Design a protein around this ligand. Structure first.
Ligand code: EW8
Length: 133
């Protein structure tokens, strides 16, 4: 059910990422480098387990999870969160919870592009990834 999300994806558009990072309390120097970074996201499955890698010249992350099962995560900005990823309306919805705060990372496919929408507080960031062969 997750299969069209699988593969290697490269960042090709970013809107409001600084707003999102600011909302999370990321410092100006980190936001500055991040605003010029173009990550590669790799999504793989092995049975029920998904692994999502995010690689860049600045920071790298990797998570593994089962859909619908909570997991601990330490984010790129060093938040220790409780996470769950589900399919909802054909979108891959990742919810992170910490200190009573929530942020969502929603992925959807539009015309073969991967659109990642990041919401925290009032900040809404939209990042577009295109598929590597
Ligand atoms: C780890 C790969 C590099 C992520 C970009 C540069 C580093 C940002 C650090 C500070 C904000 C981190 C916010 C949470 C993760 C955003 C994930 C956004 C995406 O997958 O496109």
């Amino acid at each position: 059910m997750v299969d069209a999300f699988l593969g290697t994806w490269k960042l090709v558009d970013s809107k409001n990422f600084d707003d999102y990072m600011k909302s999370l309390g990321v410092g100006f120097a980190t936001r500055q480098v991040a605003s010029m970074t173009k990550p590669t996201t790799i999504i793989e499955k092995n049975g029920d387990i998904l692994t999502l890698k995010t690689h860049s010249t600045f920071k790298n992350t990797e998570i593994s999870f089962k859909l619908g099962v909570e997991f601990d995560e330490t984010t790129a900005d060093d938040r220790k969160v409780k996470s769950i990823v589900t399919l909802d309306g054909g979108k891959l919805v990742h919810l992170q919870k910490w200190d009573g705060q929530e942020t969502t990372l929603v992925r959807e496919l539009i015309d073969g592009k991967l659109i990642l929408t990041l919401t925290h507080g009032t900040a809404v960031c939209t990042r577009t990834y295109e598929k590597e062969a």
